Symmetry: D2
Subunit: 115 residues, 4 copies
């Protein structure tokens, strides 16, 4: 528990929450298109063509990208939170395509469900 | 290692719990430069999603995650670290 | 020109751009629901009930609010850019309802059209 | 009056002009703490909208608006001041 959680049943509640959202994604109509996720990306701020490729990829997915918020971290690094909505397949496709771009140093998905 | 780092806290919360978002905001304002910004999607009548971008050493980031994630009405609060 | 624009035809280009987006909003099918706008709001960070009311108002408009990005300016002030998509009427209704909340100090609309 | 202020620069630009967004990003990174964050909506196949939140005195804010608004491929660039 000591990054230091506060008590006994505090690390476990946090686990049941992302267990329950993770069980949601597994057994829910593969083809349900309202699921939403956050893709967190850190990338080289001056990799030729990288930003344009990421834009192109997001625009070709269209309806599946709600917005992106970008932080200029420093001279070398940008962080983006890209908010996605679609089925599991469309969301994983997008994560993988952005993850496989030269200059992307980090591309991690957080799955979010409605309650 | 007491190094400043960026992190994203993803929260889903009940769009109707009174005082919840006022509490979330008080915490973030009282944290000053450790919150960079928040983005919010109104997912449906009962749920809001926020991505809250944070900046600090891992102990400061942790204290923030605890404080926001422990609020009544918060259904999900998961942290991603640089 | 001196906030200081650079030359002669530089202040005027900037005027033709928001003339042309402003002429767009005036004579385009009142009922076209794809128009998008940015509502910029500055508000009292600790006005009882203000944030909840703003959320309620945005959730009741639903599909018409794409996202909001919030900056905690200081102890007393928050800024938000609320991105809206709808017809002119839905967008103006929303601006007015947020503008008439106790604690909102500033609520200005920027209309954005596709080219 | 040489006071730091917040401002929002709303930009619409061509989602296909090569080098445009790399230029926009270079300017913002080279401006350091005068850019707080950007939010981007992919409006359609040919247009992106960004809200770029800035911080600085009115001369610094102006220099930024000029630099970003003058880029080829930028179709609209309008500033809102606190
Ligand atoms: Ni950047
Ligand atoms: Ni909401
Ligand atoms: Ni705030
Ligand atoms: Ni775009």
């Amino acid at each position: 528990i000591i990054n230091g959680y506060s008590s006994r049943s505090e690390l476990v509640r946090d686990m049941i929450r992302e267990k329950l959202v993770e069980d949601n994604w597994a057994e829910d109509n593969p083809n349900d298109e309202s699921k939403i996720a956050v893709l967190v990306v850190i990338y080289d701020a001056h990799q030729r063509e990288l930003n344009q490729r990421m834009i192109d990829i997001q625009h070709a997915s269209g309806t599946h990208v709600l917005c992106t918020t970008h932080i200029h971290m420093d001279e070398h690094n940008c962080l983006e939170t890209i908010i996605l909505q679609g089925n599991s397949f469309e969301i994983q496709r997008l994560q993988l395509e952005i993850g496989g771009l030269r200059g992307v140093k980090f591309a991690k998905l957080t799955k979010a469900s409605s309650f």
